[PDB]
Protein backbone atom coordinates (compact mmCIF):
# COMPACT_ATOMS: atom_id res chain seq x y z
CA UNK A 1 0.00 0.00 0.00
CA UNK A 2 0.94 3.66 0.34
CA UNK A 3 0.65 4.53 4.03
CA UNK A 4 0.70 1.78 6.56
CA UNK A 5 -1.63 2.48 9.48
CA UNK A 6 -1.77 3.99 12.94
CA UNK A 7 -1.21 1.82 15.98
CA UNK A 8 -4.12 3.40 17.80
CA UNK A 9 -7.04 5.19 16.29
CA UNK A 10 -8.15 7.84 18.81
CA UNK A 11 -11.71 7.77 20.03
CA UNK A 12 -14.57 9.86 18.71
CA UNK A 13 -17.02 9.80 21.61
CA UNK A 14 -16.75 13.41 22.68
CA UNK A 15 -16.23 14.12 26.35
CA UNK A 16 -18.92 16.29 27.80
CA UNK A 17 -17.87 19.66 29.20
CA UNK A 18 -17.61 20.38 32.87
CA UNK A 19 -20.37 21.82 35.00
CA UNK A 20 -19.58 25.50 34.65
CA UNK A 21 -20.13 28.02 37.42
CA UNK A 22 -21.13 31.17 35.53
CA UNK A 23 -24.68 32.01 36.41
CA UNK A 24 -26.48 35.08 35.09
CA UNK A 25 -27.10 38.04 37.32
CA UNK A 26 -29.22 40.95 36.11
CA UNK A 27 -27.76 44.09 34.64
CA UNK A 28 -26.67 46.80 37.04
CA UNK A 29 -27.56 49.90 35.08
CA UNK A 30 -25.67 53.08 35.68
CA UNK A 31 -27.24 55.87 37.70
CA UNK A 32 -27.65 58.49 34.97
CA UNK A 33 -30.28 56.32 33.23
CA UNK A 34 -33.77 56.67 34.65
CA UNK A 35 -37.11 56.39 32.81
CA UNK A 36 -38.48 59.69 31.63
CA UNK A 37 -34.97 60.65 30.57
CA UNK A 38 -33.90 62.15 27.28
CA UNK A 39 -31.15 60.34 25.43
CA UNK A 40 -28.94 60.83 22.43
CA UNK A 41 -28.25 58.05 19.98
CA UNK A 42 -24.68 57.65 18.87
CA UNK A 43 -25.19 55.04 16.17
CA UNK A 44 -27.81 53.35 14.11
CA UNK A 45 -30.14 54.65 11.48
CA UNK A 46 -31.15 57.28 14.03
CA UNK A 47 -27.76 58.53 15.07
CA UNK A 48 -27.48 61.99 16.51
CA UNK A 49 -31.18 62.05 17.33
CA UNK A 50 -32.63 62.87 20.71
CA UNK A 51 -35.14 60.42 22.10
CA UNK A 52 -36.92 59.28 25.26
CA UNK A 53 -36.22 56.37 27.61
CA UNK A 54 -39.11 54.35 29.00
CA UNK A 55 -38.20 50.86 30.13
CA UNK A 56 -35.34 48.52 30.91
CA UNK A 57 -36.02 45.24 29.15
CA UNK A 58 -34.83 41.81 30.18
CA UNK A 59 -32.17 41.33 27.49
CA UNK A 60 -30.13 44.25 28.83
CA UNK A 61 -31.81 46.64 26.38
CA UNK A 62 -33.80 49.84 26.57
CA UNK A 63 -37.19 50.80 25.25
CA UNK A 64 -37.22 54.02 23.31
CA UNK A 65 -39.37 56.39 21.27
CA UNK A 66 -38.96 59.74 19.55
CA UNK A 67 -41.88 60.01 19.72
CA UNK A 68 -42.70 59.18 16.14
CA UNK A 69 -44.89 62.24 15.62
CA UNK A 70 -41.87 64.44 16.29
CA UNK A 71 -38.80 63.04 14.59
CA UNK A 72 -39.98 59.87 12.89
CA UNK A 73 -38.58 57.55 15.57
CA UNK A 74 -40.91 54.71 16.58
CA UNK A 75 -41.00 52.42 19.55
CA UNK A 76 -37.67 50.67 19.51
CA UNK A 77 -35.16 48.68 21.52
CA UNK A 78 -31.53 49.71 21.82
CA UNK A 79 -28.38 49.19 23.82
CA UNK A 80 -27.35 51.29 26.78
CA UNK A 81 -23.70 51.56 25.82
CA UNK A 82 -24.61 53.16 22.48
CA UNK A 83 -26.39 56.22 23.88
CA UNK A 84 -26.00 59.11 26.28
CA UNK A 85 -28.06 59.87 29.37
CA UNK A 86 -28.66 63.60 29.40
CA UNK A 87 -29.58 65.55 32.50
CA UNK A 88 -32.90 66.46 30.92
CA UNK A 89 -35.83 64.83 32.69
CA UNK A 90 -39.49 64.45 31.79
CA UNK A 91 -42.35 62.55 33.39
CA UNK A 92 -43.67 59.32 31.87
CA UNK A 93 -46.09 58.34 34.61
CA UNK A 94 -49.48 57.26 33.36
CA UNK A 95 -48.15 55.12 30.49
CA UNK A 96 -49.08 51.45 30.11
CA UNK A 97 -45.74 50.27 28.78
CA UNK A 98 -46.01 46.91 30.56
CA UNK A 99 -47.30 45.22 27.41
CA UNK A 100 -43.96 45.32 25.64
CA UNK A 101 -41.32 42.62 25.81
CA UNK A 102 -38.67 41.01 23.61
CA UNK A 103 -41.17 38.80 21.78
CA UNK A 104 -42.96 41.96 20.66
CA UNK A 105 -39.89 42.57 18.47
CA UNK A 106 -39.63 39.32 16.52
CA UNK A 107 -37.83 39.45 13.19
CA UNK A 108 -39.12 36.10 11.92
CA UNK A 109 -35.73 35.37 10.33
CA UNK A 110 -35.32 35.07 6.57
CA UNK A 111 -34.32 31.85 4.85
CA UNK A 112 -31.47 31.45 2.39
CA UNK A 113 -33.59 30.72 -0.69
CA UNK A 114 -35.10 34.19 -0.29
CA UNK A 115 -32.32 36.34 -1.72
CA UNK A 116 -33.47 39.80 -2.73
CA UNK A 117 -33.02 40.59 -6.41
CA UNK A 118 -33.03 44.37 -5.91
CA UNK A 119 -35.51 45.15 -3.12
CA UNK A 120 -44.70 45.68 5.30
CA UNK A 121 -45.47 47.28 8.66
CA UNK A 122 -47.73 45.95 11.39
CA UNK A 123 -50.73 48.13 12.18
CA UNK A 124 -50.49 46.87 15.76
CA UNK A 125 -47.11 48.49 16.27
CA UNK A 126 -48.32 51.58 14.43
CA UNK A 127 -51.35 52.09 16.65
CA UNK A 128 -49.37 51.31 19.79
CA UNK A 129 -46.93 54.08 18.92
CA UNK A 130 -49.97 56.26 18.19
CA UNK A 131 -51.30 55.40 21.65
CA UNK A 132 -48.18 56.28 23.59
CA UNK A 133 -46.96 59.35 21.75
CA UNK A 134 -50.16 61.22 22.59
CA UNK A 135 -49.67 60.63 26.31
CA UNK A 136 -46.10 61.85 25.99
CA UNK A 137 -46.59 64.98 23.89
CA UNK A 138 -49.19 66.10 26.42
CA UNK A 139 -46.30 66.29 28.87
CA UNK A 140 -43.85 67.72 26.37
CA UNK A 141 -46.10 70.72 25.71
CA UNK A 142 -45.65 71.65 29.37
CA UNK A 143 -42.02 72.69 29.35
CA UNK A 144 -40.84 75.08 26.62
CA UNK A 145 -38.89 74.45 23.43
CA UNK A 146 -38.81 70.72 24.08
CA UNK A 147 -40.77 69.57 21.05
CA UNK A 148 -38.17 71.42 19.01
CA UNK A 149 -35.34 70.05 21.12
CA UNK A 150 -36.44 66.57 20.10
CA UNK A 151 -37.24 67.39 16.49
CA UNK A 152 -33.69 68.61 16.06
CA UNK A 153 -30.54 66.53 15.97
CA UNK A 154 -27.25 66.44 17.83
CA UNK A 155 -23.81 67.05 16.42
CA UNK A 156 -20.42 68.46 17.29
CA UNK A 157 -18.78 71.70 16.24
CA UNK A 158 -15.19 72.84 16.04
CA UNK A 159 -14.38 73.37 19.70
CA UNK A 160 -16.80 70.86 21.19
CA UNK A 161 -14.74 68.80 23.61
CA UNK A 162 -16.81 65.89 24.95
CA UNK A 163 -14.58 65.20 27.92
CA UNK A 164 -15.42 68.74 29.01
CA UNK A 165 -18.99 68.74 27.75
CA UNK A 166 -21.84 67.88 30.07
CA UNK A 167 -24.96 66.18 28.81
CA UNK B 1 28.02 -0.68 10.15
CA UNK B 2 27.97 2.77 8.61
CA UNK B 3 24.56 4.26 9.28
CA UNK B 4 25.26 4.21 13.01
CA UNK B 5 28.69 5.76 12.70
CA UNK B 6 28.96 9.38 13.76
CA UNK B 7 30.47 10.23 10.41
CA UNK B 8 26.90 10.34 9.21
CA UNK B 9 26.08 12.89 11.89
CA UNK B 10 29.14 15.01 11.22
CA UNK B 11 27.85 15.78 7.75
CA UNK B 12 27.42 19.53 7.59
CA UNK B 13 29.57 20.11 10.58
CA UNK B 14 32.77 21.17 8.97
CA UNK B 15 35.70 19.63 10.78
CA UNK B 16 34.15 16.19 11.28
CA UNK B 17 34.73 16.36 14.98
CA UNK B 18 38.48 16.86 14.89
CA UNK B 19 38.86 20.58 15.35
CA UNK B 20 39.28 23.86 13.61
CA UNK B 21 42.43 24.76 15.49
CA UNK B 22 44.27 21.48 15.78
CA UNK B 23 43.39 20.32 12.35
CA UNK B 24 43.50 16.54 12.05
CA UNK B 25 46.80 16.11 10.31
CA UNK B 26 48.51 12.83 9.70
CA UNK B 27 51.19 11.91 12.24
CA UNK B 28 52.05 14.86 14.44
CA UNK B 29 53.60 13.03 17.38
CA UNK B 30 55.28 10.23 15.51
CA UNK B 31 54.58 6.85 14.03
CA UNK B 32 54.15 4.11 16.57
CA UNK B 33 56.01 3.99 19.85
CA UNK B 34 58.33 6.79 18.87
CA UNK B 35 59.37 9.21 21.53
CA UNK B 36 59.49 6.73 24.36
CA UNK B 37 62.71 8.13 25.80
CA UNK B 38 61.39 11.54 24.75
CA UNK B 39 58.14 13.45 24.34
CA UNK B 40 56.07 10.33 25.20
CA UNK B 41 58.25 9.69 28.23
CA UNK B 42 55.53 10.34 30.76
CA UNK B 43 53.10 7.92 29.19
CA UNK B 44 55.77 5.27 29.23
CA UNK B 45 56.93 5.94 32.79
CA UNK B 46 53.37 6.06 34.07
CA UNK B 47 51.42 3.35 32.26
CA UNK B 48 54.14 1.04 30.89
CA UNK B 49 56.91 0.88 33.49
CA UNK B 50 59.64 -1.48 32.41
CA UNK B 51 59.37 -1.10 28.68
CA UNK B 52 62.97 0.04 28.38
CA UNK B 53 65.80 -2.26 29.30
CA UNK B 54 66.76 -5.88 29.34
CA UNK B 55 66.80 -7.90 32.52
CA UNK B 56 67.96 -11.40 32.66
CA UNK B 57 69.34 -14.54 31.21
CA UNK B 58 68.80 -15.68 27.67
CA UNK B 59 67.57 -19.10 26.65
CA UNK B 60 68.62 -20.06 23.16
CA UNK B 61 66.34 -22.58 21.48
CA UNK B 62 63.65 -22.49 24.09
CA UNK B 63 61.07 -25.17 23.47
CA UNK B 64 57.85 -24.55 25.36
CA UNK B 65 57.42 -28.24 26.06
CA UNK B 66 59.96 -28.92 28.76
CA UNK B 67 58.03 -26.38 30.81
CA UNK B 68 54.70 -28.10 30.31
CA UNK B 69 53.72 -28.39 33.95
CA UNK B 70 50.04 -27.57 34.18
CA UNK B 71 48.56 -27.59 37.61
CA UNK B 72 45.60 -29.17 39.30
CA UNK B 73 44.65 -28.03 42.74
CA UNK B 74 43.17 -30.55 45.12
CA UNK B 75 40.00 -28.49 45.13
CA UNK B 76 38.98 -30.16 41.92
CA UNK B 77 40.55 -33.66 41.86
CA UNK B 78 37.14 -35.31 41.36
CA UNK B 79 36.04 -33.61 38.20
CA UNK B 80 38.48 -36.19 36.85
CA UNK B 81 36.14 -38.88 38.16
CA UNK B 82 32.79 -39.02 36.37
CA UNK B 83 29.83 -38.16 38.57
CA UNK B 84 28.52 -41.61 37.60
CA UNK B 85 30.85 -43.29 40.10
CA UNK B 86 31.76 -40.23 42.13
CA UNK B 87 29.03 -40.58 44.73
CA UNK B 88 29.69 -44.31 44.90
CA UNK B 89 33.37 -43.84 45.64
CA UNK B 90 32.44 -41.14 48.12
CA UNK B 91 29.88 -42.99 50.22
CA UNK B 92 32.03 -46.12 49.95
CA UNK B 93 34.84 -44.20 51.61
CA UNK B 94 36.75 -47.39 52.19
CA UNK B 95 40.11 -49.04 51.85
CA UNK B 96 40.85 -51.87 49.39
CA UNK B 97 38.75 -50.18 46.69
CA UNK B 98 40.27 -46.73 46.52
CA UNK B 99 39.80 -44.96 43.19
CA UNK B 100 42.83 -44.25 41.05
CA UNK B 101 43.36 -40.93 39.32
CA UNK B 102 45.55 -40.64 36.23
CA UNK B 103 46.04 -36.89 36.04
CA UNK B 104 48.55 -37.18 33.24
CA UNK B 105 45.93 -38.78 31.02
CA UNK B 106 43.81 -35.71 31.74
CA UNK B 107 46.54 -33.20 30.95
CA UNK B 108 47.82 -32.23 34.36
CA UNK B 109 51.41 -32.52 35.44
CA UNK B 110 51.51 -31.20 38.97
CA UNK B 111 49.36 -31.41 42.09
CA UNK B 112 48.78 -28.52 44.46
CA UNK B 113 46.99 -27.97 47.73
CA UNK B 114 44.42 -25.23 47.34
CA UNK B 115 42.36 -26.88 50.04
CA UNK B 116 39.97 -29.21 51.78
CA UNK B 117 39.10 -32.35 49.94
CA UNK B 118 37.05 -34.75 52.07
CA UNK B 119 38.40 -37.41 54.42
CA UNK B 120 38.10 -40.26 51.91
CA UNK B 121 41.16 -42.24 50.74
CA UNK B 122 42.30 -41.89 47.14
CA UNK B 123 45.12 -43.11 44.92
CA UNK B 124 46.89 -40.50 42.84
CA UNK B 125 49.19 -41.03 39.90
CA UNK B 126 51.21 -37.97 39.05
CA UNK B 127 54.50 -36.60 37.86
CA UNK B 128 55.14 -33.88 40.40
CA UNK B 129 53.36 -32.80 43.55
CA UNK B 130 53.90 -30.49 46.45
CA UNK B 131 54.50 -31.06 50.12
CA UNK B 132 51.21 -29.71 51.41
CA UNK B 133 49.07 -31.50 48.86
CA UNK B 134 50.66 -34.83 49.63
CA UNK B 135 50.26 -34.21 53.36
CA UNK B 136 46.56 -33.54 52.91
CA UNK B 137 46.06 -36.65 50.80
CA UNK B 138 47.78 -39.05 53.14
CA UNK B 139 45.94 -37.38 56.00
CA UNK B 140 42.73 -38.21 54.17
CA UNK B 141 44.15 -41.74 54.06
CA UNK B 142 45.17 -41.93 50.42
CA UNK B 143 48.54 -42.15 48.76
CA UNK B 144 50.63 -40.74 45.95
CA UNK B 145 52.60 -42.83 43.48
CA UNK B 146 54.83 -41.14 40.96
CA UNK B 147 55.23 -41.84 37.27
CA UNK B 148 57.07 -40.49 34.24
Amino acid sequence: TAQQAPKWYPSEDVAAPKKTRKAVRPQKLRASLVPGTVLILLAGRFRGKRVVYLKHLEDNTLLVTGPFKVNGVPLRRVNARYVIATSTKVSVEGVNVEKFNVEYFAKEKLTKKEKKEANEIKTERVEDQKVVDKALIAEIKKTPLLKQYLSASFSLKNGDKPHMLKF
Amino acid sequence: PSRFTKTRKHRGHVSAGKGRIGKHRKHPGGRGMAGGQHHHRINMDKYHPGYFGKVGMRYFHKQQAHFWKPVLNLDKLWTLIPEDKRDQYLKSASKETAPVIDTLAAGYGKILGKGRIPNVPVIVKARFVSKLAEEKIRAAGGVVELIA
Partner: protein, 185 residues
Protein backbone atom coordinates in the same frame (compact mmCIF):
# COMPACT_ATOMS: atom_id res chain seq x y z
CA UNK C 1 17.82 35.20 34.49
CA UNK C 2 18.90 32.58 36.97
CA UNK C 3 22.07 31.88 38.92
CA UNK C 4 22.29 28.17 38.36
CA UNK C 5 23.93 26.29 41.19
CA UNK C 6 23.54 22.84 39.68
CA UNK C 7 23.48 21.57 36.15
CA UNK C 8 20.20 21.80 34.30
CA UNK C 9 18.40 18.96 32.58
CA UNK C 10 20.89 16.50 34.02
CA UNK C 11 19.76 12.92 33.82
CA UNK C 12 19.53 10.98 37.03
CA UNK C 13 22.61 9.08 35.96
CA UNK C 14 20.75 5.86 36.71
CA UNK C 15 19.18 3.20 34.58
CA UNK C 16 15.59 2.33 33.87
CA UNK C 17 13.97 0.19 31.23
CA UNK C 18 16.60 -2.50 30.60
CA UNK C 19 17.68 -1.61 27.15
CA UNK C 20 17.89 -5.18 26.01
CA UNK C 21 15.04 -6.41 23.82
CA UNK C 22 14.42 -9.58 25.82
CA UNK C 23 10.65 -9.56 25.93
CA UNK C 24 10.57 -11.91 28.91
CA UNK C 25 12.79 -9.59 30.88
CA UNK C 26 10.45 -6.77 29.98
CA UNK C 27 7.55 -8.84 31.28
CA UNK C 28 9.33 -9.38 34.57
CA UNK C 29 9.87 -5.65 34.70
CA UNK C 30 6.22 -4.96 33.92
CA UNK C 31 5.42 -7.15 36.90
CA UNK C 32 7.95 -6.02 39.45
CA UNK C 33 7.47 -2.33 38.80
CA UNK C 34 3.79 -2.89 39.54
CA UNK C 35 4.70 -4.65 42.76
CA UNK C 36 7.04 -1.84 43.75
CA UNK C 37 4.37 0.71 42.91
CA UNK C 38 1.74 -0.95 45.04
CA UNK C 39 3.26 -3.16 47.76
CA UNK C 40 5.26 -0.48 49.63
CA UNK C 41 8.03 -3.05 50.12
CA UNK C 42 11.69 -2.24 49.40
CA UNK C 43 12.57 -5.74 48.23
CA UNK C 44 10.61 -5.22 45.05
CA UNK C 45 12.41 -1.97 44.27
CA UNK C 46 15.75 -3.64 44.84
CA UNK C 47 14.91 -6.51 42.53
CA UNK C 48 13.66 -4.07 39.94
CA UNK C 49 16.80 -1.95 39.99
CA UNK C 50 18.77 -5.17 39.72
CA UNK C 51 16.95 -6.42 36.65
CA UNK C 52 18.07 -3.31 34.80
CA UNK C 53 21.72 -4.09 35.21
CA UNK C 54 24.35 -4.88 32.64
CA UNK C 55 26.17 -8.17 32.46
CA UNK C 56 29.25 -7.09 34.39
CA UNK C 57 26.88 -5.89 37.08
CA UNK C 58 24.75 -9.04 36.82
CA UNK C 59 27.64 -11.25 37.80
CA UNK C 60 27.41 -14.97 38.41
CA UNK C 61 26.76 -16.62 41.72
CA UNK C 62 27.99 -19.94 43.00
CA UNK C 63 26.15 -22.50 45.03
CA UNK C 64 29.15 -22.29 47.32
CA UNK C 65 28.30 -18.69 48.15
CA UNK C 66 24.73 -19.81 48.63
CA UNK C 67 25.80 -22.44 51.12
CA UNK C 68 27.93 -19.92 52.96
CA UNK C 69 24.87 -17.73 53.21
CA UNK C 70 22.73 -20.59 54.47
CA UNK C 71 25.33 -21.50 57.07
CA UNK C 72 24.27 -18.26 58.71
CA UNK C 73 22.01 -18.54 61.72
CA UNK C 74 18.26 -18.30 61.34
CA UNK C 75 18.80 -18.49 57.59
CA UNK C 76 18.58 -22.16 56.64
CA UNK C 77 14.86 -22.30 55.81
CA UNK C 78 15.07 -18.92 54.10
CA UNK C 79 14.59 -18.54 50.37
CA UNK C 80 17.51 -17.32 48.32
CA UNK C 81 17.31 -14.85 45.45
CA UNK C 82 19.80 -13.95 42.76
CA UNK C 83 19.18 -11.40 40.06
CA UNK C 84 21.51 -13.09 37.66
CA UNK C 85 22.72 -16.57 36.95
CA UNK C 86 23.76 -19.44 39.16
CA UNK C 87 26.80 -21.59 38.59
CA UNK C 88 28.00 -24.85 40.02
CA UNK C 89 31.11 -25.48 42.04
CA UNK C 90 33.00 -28.75 42.34
CA UNK C 91 34.87 -27.20 45.25
CA UNK C 92 32.12 -28.51 47.53
CA UNK C 93 30.36 -31.82 47.96
CA UNK C 94 27.53 -31.18 50.42
CA UNK C 95 24.53 -29.05 49.73
CA UNK C 96 21.23 -28.55 51.61
CA UNK C 97 17.62 -28.91 50.47
CA UNK C 98 17.04 -25.20 50.09
CA UNK C 99 14.91 -23.61 47.41
CA UNK C 100 16.36 -20.95 45.13
CA UNK C 101 15.06 -18.40 42.65
CA UNK C 102 16.92 -16.72 39.84
CA UNK C 103 16.87 -15.84 36.19
CA UNK C 104 19.19 -18.45 34.76
CA UNK C 105 20.48 -21.74 36.02
CA UNK C 106 23.24 -23.73 34.49
CA UNK C 107 22.56 -27.39 33.97
CA UNK C 108 25.14 -28.29 36.59
CA UNK C 109 23.73 -26.00 39.23
CA UNK C 110 20.18 -27.10 38.60
CA UNK C 111 21.20 -30.73 38.77
CA UNK C 112 23.10 -30.20 42.01
CA UNK C 113 20.25 -28.38 43.69
CA UNK C 114 17.50 -30.77 42.67
CA UNK C 115 19.74 -33.70 43.54
CA UNK C 116 19.86 -32.12 46.99
CA UNK C 117 16.06 -32.09 47.03
CA UNK C 118 15.79 -28.35 46.45
CA UNK C 119 14.20 -26.53 43.55
CA UNK C 120 15.37 -23.97 41.02
CA UNK C 121 12.71 -21.37 40.44
CA UNK C 122 11.92 -18.32 38.37
CA UNK C 123 11.18 -14.91 39.75
CA UNK C 124 7.60 -15.03 38.46
CA UNK C 125 6.95 -17.96 40.76
CA UNK C 126 8.87 -16.18 43.48
CA UNK C 127 6.50 -13.24 43.26
CA UNK C 128 3.43 -15.39 43.91
CA UNK C 129 5.16 -17.39 46.62
CA UNK C 130 6.41 -14.25 48.38
CA UNK C 131 5.28 -10.91 46.96
CA UNK C 132 6.57 -8.59 49.70
CA UNK C 133 9.74 -10.63 50.07
CA UNK C 134 8.78 -12.95 52.89
CA UNK C 135 11.66 -14.91 54.38
CA UNK C 136 13.98 -14.07 51.50
CA UNK C 137 17.69 -13.47 51.24
CA UNK C 138 19.24 -11.58 48.35
CA UNK C 139 22.71 -12.23 47.02
CA UNK C 140 24.74 -10.35 44.46
CA UNK C 141 28.10 -11.42 43.25
CA UNK C 142 31.56 -9.93 43.17
CA UNK C 143 32.45 -7.25 40.64
CA UNK C 144 36.04 -6.42 41.52
CA UNK C 145 37.11 -9.93 40.56
CA UNK C 146 37.05 -9.03 36.89
CA UNK C 147 40.32 -8.92 35.04
CA UNK C 148 39.66 -5.45 33.69
CA UNK C 149 39.57 -3.90 37.17
CA UNK C 150 43.18 -4.88 37.67
CA UNK C 151 44.00 -2.20 35.11
CA UNK C 152 41.75 0.47 36.63
CA UNK C 153 43.67 3.32 38.17
CA UNK C 154 47.04 2.28 36.85
CA UNK C 155 49.64 4.69 38.04
CA UNK C 156 52.71 4.48 40.21
CA UNK C 157 52.55 3.06 43.73
CA UNK C 158 49.12 1.53 43.24
CA UNK C 159 49.60 -2.15 42.47
CA UNK C 160 47.39 -1.98 39.46
CA UNK C 161 48.43 -4.25 36.68
CA UNK C 162 49.37 -2.59 33.36
CA UNK C 163 47.32 -3.31 30.29
CA UNK C 164 49.32 -5.88 28.38
CA UNK C 165 49.07 -8.93 26.15
CA UNK C 166 52.30 -10.86 26.46
CA UNK C 167 53.65 -11.80 29.85
CA UNK C 168 57.15 -12.85 30.62
CA UNK C 169 60.67 -11.70 30.98
CA UNK C 170 61.53 -8.69 28.80
CA UNK C 171 57.91 -7.49 28.95
CA UNK C 172 57.87 -4.74 31.55
CA UNK C 173 60.23 -6.15 34.15
CA UNK C 174 62.81 -3.44 33.69
CA UNK C 175 63.31 0.32 34.13
CA UNK C 176 60.70 1.42 36.61
CA UNK C 177 60.20 -2.02 38.13
CA UNK C 178 63.50 -2.76 39.86
CA UNK C 179 66.14 -0.61 41.53
CA UNK C 180 69.06 -1.83 39.46
CA UNK C 181 67.55 -0.47 36.25
CA UNK C 182 67.13 3.16 37.03
CA UNK C 183 64.36 3.26 39.55
CA UNK C 184 61.31 1.46 40.90
CA UNK C 185 57.89 2.87 40.17
Amino acid sequence: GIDHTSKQHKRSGHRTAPKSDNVYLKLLVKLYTFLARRTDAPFNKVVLKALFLSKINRPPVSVSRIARALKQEGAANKTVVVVGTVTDDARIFEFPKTTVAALRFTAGARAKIVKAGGECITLDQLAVRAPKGQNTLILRGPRNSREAVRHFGMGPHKGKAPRILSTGRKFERARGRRRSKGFKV
